[PDB]
């Protein structure tokens, strides 16, 4: 019971950390897709 407690403390703390990282990775990606998709439109439009 002391080892399951310890193991589950860690697991839970790793999870949260993973959560915090994926979230930040998500926002970076979200911002780059928009920027990326918009530069693509501008390039096409300017070439005309």
């Amino acid at each position: 019971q002391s080892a399951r407690m310890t193991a589950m403390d860690n697991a839970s703390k790793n999870a949260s950390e993973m959560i915090d990282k994926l979230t930040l990775t998500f926002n970076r990606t979200r911002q780059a897709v928009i920027t990326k998709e918009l530069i693509e439109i501008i390039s096409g439009a300017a070439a005309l």
């Binding site: 998709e37 693509e40 439109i41 096409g44 439009a45 005309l48």
Partner: protein, 467 residues
């Protein structure tokens, strides 16, 4: 009128008329060519110059070349003498069997049926496919859409529906191949013949064919669907019959347009598409419809670029359908064919008031459990299965068996599955699932449920597997 070619850049040709400017949509014929080249007028640039889209190759055209206004949009041979035949974007036979002697001719461009012409009858159209029937029933006279990325089953599914439905159908059928594989029109034509749906000796043909494959210039691809659809509208209105319309693949109509779009001088909309995508799709999709005069049962294959269902094209097409079968490479990848996604497929008739509560409670019953299992998937992945409640490891069970019971050996894919094709009747389906959901087979092995028709084959297969 007679115009001259002033500029050639790919499929786009600009023409200058001295007197009398052909209206937009008018078809012009290029003079001096071994083969018939039609140019559809696309825009009035001003200065008595029109910008047009070529219906074929632009090689060998010359600046100054002559062009005659035909005085009307592309018009094709429409009528019963189109049945059993193979036509072009521009209505020319391409089957080497001579002219198509129709009484009338129709322009491929036309307005869509008015609001007061709509019909609202809703009859389930049983197909013999477990998944579709159970969860996303097709409807007679309704608009059906098969969505899928490259190589997930759109066409084979269209192939088994032609077999399980087109073949018994008492009425015509029009199969329009838009920007797909030439090999495929040759496979289907010869199959139609070997099964008498096409009769080369008599007038018993029950299917007209129109083709504008992937080896064609954007222009042809931006119009075959129109030609195809036009043939079908005739049997709907002028004869009043029950038509079956197959289009594979309507995405090609939209890709065709995006391919000339820049040469038409337009700022691109998102994802590269042309800014008129939705309206271009709207004025077309709105003709593919059942009216009070006749009924159309359209089955349209819809390609999904990069596998992304949010892509402006696939995305813009959902609204035009009454039933949708969404195929997924993630399912296919597991060997589950047809690879329909049970949680992303829908039908407007999945209503207790229309299919009944037994049909309805089973369907939703099957979907809840697959959803319930989807959610657990990522978690037992890491944390394993021991901690799960026997209540929850039973839904993992049943789900995995249902997941399989939803696959089926198609009669048009024996070359693929190495299994005889099975067609299951609506009641054999509802019942089979009802029992799995009821716990009545928690003893048989999952594998017993994979690639089988009716539930009895799953029971038999258990024994065969029993050793």
């Amino acid at each position: 009128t007679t115009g001259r070619i002033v500029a050639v850049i790919g499929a786009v040709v600009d023409v200058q008329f001295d007197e009398g400017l052909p209206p937009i949509l008018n078809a012009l014929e290029v003079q001096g060519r071994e083969t018939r080249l039609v140019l559809e007028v696309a825009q009035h640039l001003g200065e008595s110059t029109v910008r047009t889209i070529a219906m074929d190759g632009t090689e060998g055209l010359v600046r100054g070349q002559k062009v005659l206004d035909s005085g009307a949009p592309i018009r094709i041979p429409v009528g019963p003498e189109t049945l059993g035949r193979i036509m072009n974007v521009i209505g020319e036979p391409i089957d080497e069997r001579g002219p198509i002697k129709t009484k009338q001719f129709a322009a491929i461009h036309a307005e869509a049926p008015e609001f007061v012409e709509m019909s609202v009858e809703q009859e389930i159209l049983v197909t013999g496919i477990k998944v579709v029937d159970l969860l996303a029933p097709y409807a007679k006279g309704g608009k059906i859409g098969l969505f899928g990325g490259a190589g997930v089953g759109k066409t084979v599914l269209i192939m088994e529906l032609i077999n399980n439905v087109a073949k018994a159908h008492g009425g015509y059928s029009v199969f329009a191949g838009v920007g797909e594989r030439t090999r495929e029109g040759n496979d289907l034509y010869h199959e139609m013949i070997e099964s008498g749906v096409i009769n080369l000796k008599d007038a018993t043909s029950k299917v007209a064919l129109v083709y504008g494959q992937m080896n064609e210039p954007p222009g042809a691809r931006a119009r075959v669907a129109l030609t195809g659809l036009t043939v079908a509208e005739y049997f709907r209105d002028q004869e009043g019959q029950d038509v079956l319309l197959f289009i594979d693949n309507i995405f090609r109509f939209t890709q065709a347009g995006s391919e000339v779009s820049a040469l038409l001088g337009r700022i691109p909309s998102a994802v590269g598409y042309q800014p008129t995508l939705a309206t271009d799709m709207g004025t077309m999709q709105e003709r593919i419809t059942t009216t009070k005069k006749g009924s159309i049962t359209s089955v349209q294959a819809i390609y999904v670029p990069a596998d992304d269902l949010t892509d402006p094209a696939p995305a813009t097409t959902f609204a035009h359908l009454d039933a949708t079968t969404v195929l997924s490479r993630a399912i296919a990848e597991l060997g589950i064919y047809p690879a329909v996604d049970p949680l992303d497929s829908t039908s407007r008739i999945m209503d207790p008031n229309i299919v009944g509560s037994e049909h309805y409670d089973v369907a939703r019953g099957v979907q809840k459990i697959l959803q319930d299992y989807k959610s657990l998937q990522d978690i037992i992945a890491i944390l394993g299965m021991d901690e799960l409640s026997e209540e929850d490891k039973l839904t993992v069970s049943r789900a995995r068996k249902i997941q399989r019971f939803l696959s089926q050996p198609f009669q048009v894919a024996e070359v693929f599955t190495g299994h005889l094709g099975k067609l299951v009747p609506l009641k054999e389906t509802i019942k089979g699932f009802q029992q799995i959901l009821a716990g009545e087979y928690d003893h048989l092995p999952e594998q017993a449920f994979y690639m089988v028709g009716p539930i009895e084959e799953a029971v038999a297969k258990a024994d065969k597997l029993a050793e």
